[PDB]
Amino acid sequence: MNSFYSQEELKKIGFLSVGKNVLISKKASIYNPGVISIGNNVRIDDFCILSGKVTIGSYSHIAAYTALYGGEVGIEMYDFANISSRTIVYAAIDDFSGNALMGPTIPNQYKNVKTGKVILKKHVIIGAHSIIFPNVVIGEGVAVGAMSMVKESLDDWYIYVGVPVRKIKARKRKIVELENEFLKSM
Amino acid sequence: MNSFYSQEELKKIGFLSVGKNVLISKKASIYNPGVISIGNNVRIDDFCILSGKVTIGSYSHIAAYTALYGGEVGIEMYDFANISSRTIVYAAIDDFSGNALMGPTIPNQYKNVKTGKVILKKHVIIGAHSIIFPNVVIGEGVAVGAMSMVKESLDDWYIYVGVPVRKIKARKRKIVELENEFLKSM
Amino acid sequence: MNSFYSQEELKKIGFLSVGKNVLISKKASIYNPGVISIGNNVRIDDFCILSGKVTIGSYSHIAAYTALYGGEVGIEMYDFANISSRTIVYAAIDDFSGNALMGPTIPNQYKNVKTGKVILKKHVIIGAHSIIFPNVVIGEGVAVGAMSMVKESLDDWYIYVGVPVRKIKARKRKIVELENEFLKSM
Numbered sequence: 001m002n003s004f005y006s007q008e009e010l011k012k013i014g015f016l017s018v019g020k021n022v023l024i025s026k027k028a029s030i031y032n033p034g035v036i037s038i039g040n041n042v043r044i045d046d047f048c049i050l051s052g053k054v055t056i057g058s059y060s061h062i063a064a065y066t067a068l069y070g071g072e073v074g075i076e077m078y079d080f081a082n083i084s085s086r087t088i089v090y091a092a093i094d095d096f097s098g099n100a101l102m103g104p105t106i107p108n109q110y111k112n113v114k115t116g117k118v119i120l121k122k123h124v125i126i127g128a129h130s131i132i133f134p135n136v137v138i139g140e141g142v143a144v145g146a147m148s149m150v151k152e153s154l155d156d157w158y159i160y161v162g163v164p165v166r167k168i169k170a171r172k173r174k175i176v177e178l179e180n181e182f183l184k185s186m
Numbered sequence: 187m188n189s190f191y192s193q194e195e196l197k198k199i200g201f202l203s204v205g206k207n208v209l210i211s212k213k214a215s216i217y218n219p220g221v222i223s224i225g226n227n228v229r230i231d232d233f234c235i236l237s238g239k240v241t242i243g244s245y246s247h248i249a250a251y252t253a254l255y256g257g258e259v260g261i262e263m264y265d266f267a268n269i270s271s272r273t274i275v276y277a278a279i280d281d282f283s284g285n286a287l288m289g290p291t292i293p294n295q296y297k298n299v300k301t302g303k304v305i306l307k308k309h310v311i312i313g314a315h316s317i318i319f320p321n322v323v324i325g326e327g328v329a330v331g332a333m334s335m336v337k338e339s340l341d342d343w344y345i346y347v348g349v350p351v352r353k354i355k356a357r358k359r360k361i362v363e364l365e366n367e368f369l370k371s372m
Numbered sequence: 373m374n375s376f377y378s379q380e381e382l383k384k385i386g387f388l389s390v391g392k393n394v395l396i397s398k399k400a401s402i403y404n405p406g407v408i409s410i411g412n413n414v415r416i417d418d419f420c421i422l423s424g425k426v427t428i429g430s431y432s433h434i435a436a437y438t439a440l441y442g443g444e445v446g447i448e449m450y451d452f453a454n455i456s457s458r459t460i461v462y463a464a465i466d467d468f469s470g471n472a473l474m475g476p477t478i479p480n481q482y483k484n485v486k487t488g489k490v491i492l493k494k495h496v497i498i499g500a501h502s503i504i505f506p507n508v509v510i511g512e513g514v515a516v517g518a519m520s521m522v523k524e525s526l527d528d529w530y531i532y533v534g535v536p537v538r539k540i541k542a543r544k545r546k547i548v549e550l551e552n553e554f555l556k557s558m
């Protein structure tokens with residue numbers, strides 16, 4: 001079976017914008033669909049949470065349990081980006097340092113929230129159980145491994161692993177040739 | 187949108203005690219609520235689980251996916267403690283050594299469950315995707331980083347990271363001041 | 373207060389096979405029950421996902437949030453095997469190298485999915501927040517620590533930790549007697 005909303009159910013959600021062949025679990029949470037644009041051929045799985053400003057392009061899988069906290073600044077994924085299960089992407093984060101109170105029970109003037117657009121460029125893949133922090137551009141074709149923590153921007157076409165991640169090898173570009181192949185045959 | 191119970195449904199859950207301005211997700215799970223006590227200005231998000239003895243004070247966020255397995259001995263959080271997404275706090279665990287059978291499918295006399303009260307003191311923040319094992323006090327003002335694992339009590343006012351955690355630098359104490367300033371404020 | 377199906381609703385799911393004393397959360401997701409079999413005395417908790425080909429023996433707990441993506445080649449667990457919360461087992465994963473396109477939105481010609489049966493032998497325990505990848509045999513009596521990642525088969529009766537896992541000590545085998553002793557009671 002599957003848990004995906006109908007085309008009929010989907011247009012009732014109220015997305016800023018939703019494309020063709022979009023498959024979204026009835027078990028995801030979508031908060032403020034008003035600020036969420038989704039392109040074509042996108043699958044969002046069980047127990048995802050998308051909240052605040054989120055832009056997804058086309059050909060992207062958001063695997064189960066993944067939370068995207070877009071806040072005001074937003075999270076944007078370009079085409080052919082994918083995110084494996086249990087990832088968190090934060091576009092805002094509280095100050096852990098001891099210099100500020102923390103979290104949504106507390107008025108902003110006591111906190112020191114860090115906020116910044118998070119961008120995943122084309123062909124980015126994020127491995128399972130990973131965390132991406134605010135104000136981070138994940139460069140084109142970057143792979144980050146499972147269980148990775150990314151606190152700053154990542155250079156294009158590299159593979160990274162660890163907490164926090166380190167650059168371990170080049171990502172191959174064959175994928176770009178297959179993109180063009182795939183598209184050409186449509 | 188939002189997924190919270192109204193103050194009216196909350197009253198029907200049958201909590202040991204629940205204060206005001208409590209926002210609990212309808213997508214969270216609550217088992218044995220008659221041993222669960224929640225103070226004022228608490229938020230518990232989608233997909234959290236609270237099970238068995240759990241005591242939360244005030245000005246606390248339990249972010250999404252976080253499981254608090256309080257068992258019979260309990261987990262207690264003091265005021266201004268917050269737990270980030272996908273954290274687990276166990277007050278009991280099975281013996282992994284090979285010296286016992288394991289899990290809820292096996293009866294106790296063949297197991298060797300390790301149990302003990304867990305306490306998160308005031309101003310503790312627990313980073314996302316972290317695990318706290320039983321019989322542990324997380325010190326006053328401690329921050330535990332993301333993806334960290336805690337098996338022992340932690341000294342006050344430090345930041346710890348890793349699996350298992352190590353101390354990396356003092357937590358700043360400004361928040362004590364901010365706590366007074368904020369509380370004055372009302 | 374628990375969230376399990378009755379034995380009656382269980383039969384309405386359409387498992388290849390379901391034993392007795394099987395406690396499955398209504399909050400778990402089960403996809404393609406037709407290829408899933410479960411033996412006796414098994415508990416599957418909230419927000420679990422079982423997808424594709426999955427075979428569970430007896431006396432096994434699959435804890436909250438755990439995802440078993442059995443695909444076509446399958447995941448098998450033998451008796452007395454248990455998986456702690458927020459674990460992922462994959463029988464298939466995409467190629468992260470950059471030599472292929474990725475994920476369920478892309479046709480198979482353009483991908484290079486690696487596939488392989490995952491087997492957990494008797495008495496295996498997998499710690500919370502762990503990830504097991506395809507084509508892996510976890511030998512009998514293996515314990516994998518929390519927050520660990522397994523890409524290769526594991527030697528029987530050892531304890532392994534880390535990302536990727538390294539062997540750290542033997543598992544005790546007192547478990548083997550206890551099993552005999554307990555089964556006698558039955």
Ligand SMILES: CC(C)(COP(=O)(O)OP(=O)(O)OC[C@H]1O[C@@H](n2cnc3c(N)ncnc32)[C@H](O)[C@@H]1OP(=O)(O)O)[C@@H](O)C(=O)NCCC(=O)NCCS
Pocket residue numbers: 084085126127128144145146147148159160161162163168462464465466468469521535536
């Ligand atoms: C990143 C990954 C692609 C690396 O695979 P690889 O290219 O086969 O690299 P190796 O296995 O040789 O590892 C290279 C180095 O990185 C380390 N490493 C590999 N993956 C790591 C990870 N996730 N975290 C930390 N270290 C990692 C290895 O220990 C090795 O270190 P060394 O050079 O110090 O020995 C793979 O390990 C991974 O993390 N895959 C994620 C799969 C996934 O999440 N899939 C979702 C379902 S599609």
Ligand SMILES: CC(C)(COP(=O)(O)OP(=O)(O)OC[C@H]1O[C@@H](n2cnc3c(N)ncnc32)[C@H](O)[C@@H]1OP(=O)(O)O)[C@@H](O)C(=O)NCCC(=O)NCCS
Pocket residue numbers: 090092093094096097149163164270271312313314330331332333334345346347348349354
């Ligand atoms: C713990 C944290 C606050 C430390 O950040 P920082 O004070 O800026 O410290 P740095 O990034 O300089 O790192 C200091 C050391 O700890 C390591 N480190 C930092 N965070 C780590 C983590 N979570 N796990 C393991 N190692 C970590 C760094 O590698 C560095 O090691 P080194 O001195 O051996 O090089 C931050 O890394 C973190 O984990 N934040 C969690 C945020 C979160 O979960 N938010 C939830 C939503 S509000």
Ligand SMILES: CC(C)(COP(=O)(O)OP(=O)(O)OC[C@H]1O[C@@H](n2cnc3c(N)ncnc32)[C@H](O)[C@@H]1OP(=O)(O)O)[C@@H](O)C(=O)NCCC(=O)NCCS
Pocket residue numbers: 276278279280282283335349350456457498499500516517518519520531532533534535540
């Ligand atoms: C694997 C585990 C059982 C080991 O515990 P232990 O036998 O008491 O071993 P120790 O705590 O002495 O650690 C031994 C070594 O392994 C390292 N280690 C222990 N657990 C680790 C883990 N989960 N990840 C990485 N390293 C780990 C230690 O740092 C130590 O390293 P060193 O030899 O380099 O100093 C335990 O740490 C663990 O992970 N338990 C998982 C519990 C769980 O998930 N329970 C689910 C609820 S029932």
Ligand SMILES: Cc1cn([C@H]2C[C@H](O)[C@@H](COP(=O)(O)OP(=O)(O)O[C@H]3O[C@H](C)[C@@H](N)[C@H](O)[C@H]3O)O2)c(=O)[nH]c1=O
Pocket residue numbers: 001002003004025044045046061063064083084085403421423424441442443464465466475476485
């Ligand atoms: C996870 C999930 C599955 N399903 C249904 C519909 C699907 O067609 C079917 C199988 O989905 P699946 O996710 O088990 O299998 P796949 O479609 O192969 O995808 C999975 O394996 C890949 C190698 C990974 N890259 C993905 O991250 C992982 O989700 O089950 C749902 O309806 N909702 C879900 O959340």
Ligand SMILES: Cc1cn([C@H]2C[C@H](O)[C@@H](COP(=O)(O)OP(=O)(O)O[C@H]3O[C@H](C)[C@@H](N)[C@H](O)[C@H]3O)O2)c(=O)[nH]c1=O
Pocket residue numbers: 031049051052069070071092093094103104113187188189190211230231232233247249250270271
């Ligand atoms: C996650 C979640 C959200 N919501 C709704 C109600 C909320 O007011 C709204 C916004 O929630 P949000 O969590 O997206 O955004 P914030 O309210 O800023 O909270 C979040 O960012 C912080 C900087 C972190 N420290 C928190 O751990 C993180 O959860 O969405 C729910 O109703 N239920 C939920 O579980």
Ligand SMILES: Cc1cn([C@H]2C[C@H](O)[C@@H](COP(=O)(O)OP(=O)(O)O[C@H]3O[C@H](C)[C@@H](N)[C@H](O)[C@H]3O)O2)c(=O)[nH]c1=O
Pocket residue numbers: 217235237238255256257278279280289290299373374375376397416417418435436456457
């Ligand atoms: C997690 C969960 C709990 N429950 C209900 C019925 C249960 O009998 C009761 C308590 O179960 P619990 O998981 O809170 O507690 P326990 O039955 O002790 O089990 C737990 O502690 C062990 C030491 C760990 N090995 C397990 O991984 C952990 O799940 O709550 C549910 O109905 N559904 C659930 O998903």
Ligand SMILES: [Cl-]
Pocket residue numbers: 065086251272437458
């Ligand atoms: Cl999760």
